């Protein structure tokens, strides 16, 4: 029975508004309603992995697991295995997989981050799950960020605290936060970004939604505008939104947006908004295609509609050769030529690199580079031809070209990372000097660049 080279992943996000669900929620798992929807001809075909994020979830873990498993069994006739379930307050993530994947899944990690301080600590934050699927790392984050049209800066701060402090994936990757630890990272939830238009435009906004004319609303979506200005979710993707705003509805219909200020809302307006979102970030040149992104029309127990997204995602097998794992394969090498880092830092310490990869027995520390002044005020750290030759565990090009090298640039004085990036080994050629590039980030913010050339030797 062959190992897959592709899987399909369902991502769901639903703020349940502290209400039990209705008896039927199958439309959610089938990607039916508004937006980019799944073809009817696929309805019996199970996804490989279902990841369900809920917010304001009033159910026990047991109660929700029963509803999810029975939902998927009715759809697919498959009894899904529970990979992980993790709850922080009323924020929950559930990972379910086809039984045929049970022995493909390992290294399951769960964590949560509570956001805010005092007043603002007690119900917002994130839960997450990570695991290996054969040779591929997968990470999943469900976050409920700060509410309120006038708190986009707080939401961006929540994002940075979640990606700094959520402890998922391989702890040996110590310089790297979750935005570098996974082949595929899915981040979803009630991100709570609003359509930033005047309160007096509420009925105009409703009109536009009834006409399915979303262009002038999306141009004011705080998540799209904040992402465009590189304030949040740097280097994440999102599919185009072609579904109505998922918030704020009157319960038990989808016919009415309830936007007016009420004591129940702290006298705040809730203009129609795309609160409920799915984004992702995959390593360079790994196959990831969004095949649905939409909202249900028939689940109305909450003031939010459920959102679905599905993805094709490239996966690799757990590779064994006569040599690695357990030794190097002398027929393989990774060389870096003419490499330099450009850092936004004002500091004057020496810097060294760390190369981390599951194609190495352990990470590799370089010698210090040579600092020069850049023409426009920057620090340029030159490595020239000084970088250590990396010794992969397996030389087979069917393995090695699918791998990635994570790069950290660290201060010699403090050993702290100033920047983290990732280089794909999916090169146009082997035994050939080829340009490489990655931006560098720290706490998910741009801190500089790493560029140079690579020369990859495989056994072919
Ligand atoms: C195969 C195995 N033995 C111990 C732990 N695992 C990984 C695991 C745990 C729970 C659910 C799944 C699935 N699906 C996989």
UniProtKB/Swiss-Prot annotation:
GO terms for molecular function: inositol-1,3,4,5-tetrakisphosphate 5-phosphatase activity; inositol-polyphosphate 5-phosphatase activity; phosphatidylinositol-3,4,5-trisphosphate 3-phosphatase activity; phosphatidylinositol-3,4,5-trisphosphate 5-phosphatase activity; phosphatidylinositol-4,5-bisphosphate 5-phosphatase activity; SH3 domain binding. Phosphatidylinositol (PtdIns) phosphatase that specifically hydrolyzes the 5-phosphate of phosphatidylinositol-3,4,5-trisphosphate (PtdIns(3,4,5)P3) to produce PtdIns(3,4)P2, thereby negatively regulating the PI3K (phosphoinositide 3-kinase) pathways. Able also to hydrolyzes the 5-phosphate of phosphatidylinositol-4,5-bisphosphate (PtdIns(4,5)P3) and inositol 1,3,4,5-tetrakisphosphate. Acts as a negative regulator of B-cell antigen receptor signaling. Tyrosine phosphorylated by the members of the SRC family after exposure to a diverse array of extracellular stimuli such as cytokines, growth factors, antibodies, chemokines, integrin ligands and hypertonic and oxidative stress. Phosphorylated upon IgG receptor FCGR2B-binding. This is Phosphatidylinositol 3,4,5-trisphosphate 5-phosphatase 1. Disulfide bonds: none annotated. Belongs to the inositol 1,4,5-trisphosphate 5-phosphatase family. Interacts with tyrosine phosphorylated form of SHC1. Interacts with tyrosine phosphorylated form of DOK1. Interacts with tyrosine phosphorylated form of DOK3. Interacts with tyrosine phosphorylated form of SLAMF1/CD150. Interacts with PTPN11 in response to IL-3. Interacts with receptor EPOR. Interacts with receptors MS4A2/FCER1B and FCER1G. Interacts with receptors FCGR2B and FCGR3. Interacts with receptor FCGR2A, leading to regulate gene expression during the phagocytic process. Interacts with GRB2. Interacts with PLCG1. Interacts with tyrosine kinases SRC and TEC. Interacts with c-Met/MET. The gene is INPP5D. It is found in: Cytoplasm; Cell membrane; Membrane raft; Cytoplasm, Cytoskeleton. The keyword NADP does not apply. Keywords: Apoptosis, Cell membrane, Cytoplasm, Cytoskeleton, Hydrolase, Immunity, Lipid metabolism, Membrane, Phosphoprotein, Repeat, SH2 domain, SH3-binding. Specifically expressed in immune and hematopoietic cells. Expressed in bone marrow and blood cells. Levels vary considerably within this compartment. Present in at least 74% of immature CD34+ cells, whereas within the more mature population of CD33+ cells, it is present in only 10% of cells. Present in the majority of T-cells, while it is present in a minority of B-cells (at protein level). Signal peptide: none annotated. GO terms for biological process: apoptotic process; determination of adult lifespan; immunoglobulin mediated immune response; intracellular signal transduction; negative regulation of B cell proliferation; negative regulation of bone resorption; negative regulation of interleukin-6 production; negative regulation of monocyte differentiation. It comes from Homo sapiens (Human). Its main location: cytoplasm. The SH2 domain interacts with tyrosine phosphorylated forms of proteins such as SHC1 or PTPN11/SHP-2. It competes with that of GRB2 for binding to phosphorylated SHC1 to inhibit the Ras pathway. It is also required for tyrosine phosphorylation. GO terms for cellular component: cytoplasm; cytoskeleton; cytosol; membrane raft; plasma membrane.
């Amino acid at each position: 029975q062959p190992e897959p080279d592709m899987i399909t992943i369902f991502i769901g996000t639903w703020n349940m508004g502290n209400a039990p669900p209705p008896k039927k929620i199958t439309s959610w798992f089938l990607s039916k309603g508004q937006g980019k929807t799944r073809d009817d001809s696929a309805d019996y075909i199970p996804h490989d992995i279902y990841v369900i994020g809920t917010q304001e979830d009033p159910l026990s873990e047991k109660e929700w697991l029963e509803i999810l498993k029975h939902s998927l069994q009715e759809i697919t006739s498959v009894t899904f295995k529970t990979v992980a379930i993790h709850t922080l307050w009323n924020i929950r993530i559930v990972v379910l997989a086809k039984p045929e994947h049970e022995n493909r899944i390992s290294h399951i990690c769960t964590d949560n981050v509570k956001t805010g301080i005092a007043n603002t600590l007690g119900n917002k934050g994130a839960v997450g799950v990570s695991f290996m699927f054969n040779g591929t790392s997968l990470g999943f984050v469900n976050s409920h960020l700060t509410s309120g049209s006038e708190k986009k800066l707080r939401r961006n701060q929540n994002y940075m605290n979640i990606l700094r402090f959520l402890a998922l994936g391989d702890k040996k990757l110590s310089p790297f936060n979750i935005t570098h630890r996974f082949t595929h990272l899915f981040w979803f939830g009630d991100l709570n970004y609003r359509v930033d238009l005047p309160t007096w435009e509420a009925e105009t906004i409703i009109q536009k939604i009834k006409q399915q004319q979303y262009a002038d609303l999306l141009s004011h979506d705080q998540l799209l505008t904040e992402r465009r200005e590189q304030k949040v979710f740097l280097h994440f993707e999102e599919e185009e939104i072609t579904f109505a705003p998922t918030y704020r509805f009157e319960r038990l219909t989808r016919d009415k947006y309830a936007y007016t200020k009420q004591k129940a809302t702290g006298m705040k307006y809730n203009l129609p908004s795309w609160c409920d979102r799915v984004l992702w970030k995959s390593y360079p040149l790994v196959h990831v295609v969004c095949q649905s992104y939409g909202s249900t029309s028939d689940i109305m127990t909450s003031d939010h509609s459920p959102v679905f997204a599905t993805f094709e995602a490239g996966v690799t097998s757990q590779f064994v050769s006569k040599n690695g794992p357990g030794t190097v394969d002398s027929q393989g090498q990774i060389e870096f030529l003419r490499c330099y880092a450009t850092l936004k830092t004002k500091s004057q310490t020496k810097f060294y690199l760390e190369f981390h990869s599951s194609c190495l027995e352990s990470f590799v520390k370089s010698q210090e580079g040579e600092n020069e002044e850049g023409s426009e005020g920057e620090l340029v750290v030159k490595f020239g031809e000084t970088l250590p030759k990396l010794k992969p565990i397996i030389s087979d090009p069917e393995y090695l070209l699918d791998q990635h090298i994570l790069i950290s640039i660290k201060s010699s004085d403090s050993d702290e990372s100033y920047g983290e990036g990732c280089i794909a080994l999916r090169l146009e050629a082997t035994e050939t000097q080829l340009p490489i590039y990655t931006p560098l980030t720290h706490h998910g913010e741009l801190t500089g660049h790493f560029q140079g050339e690579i020369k990859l030797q495989t056994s072919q």
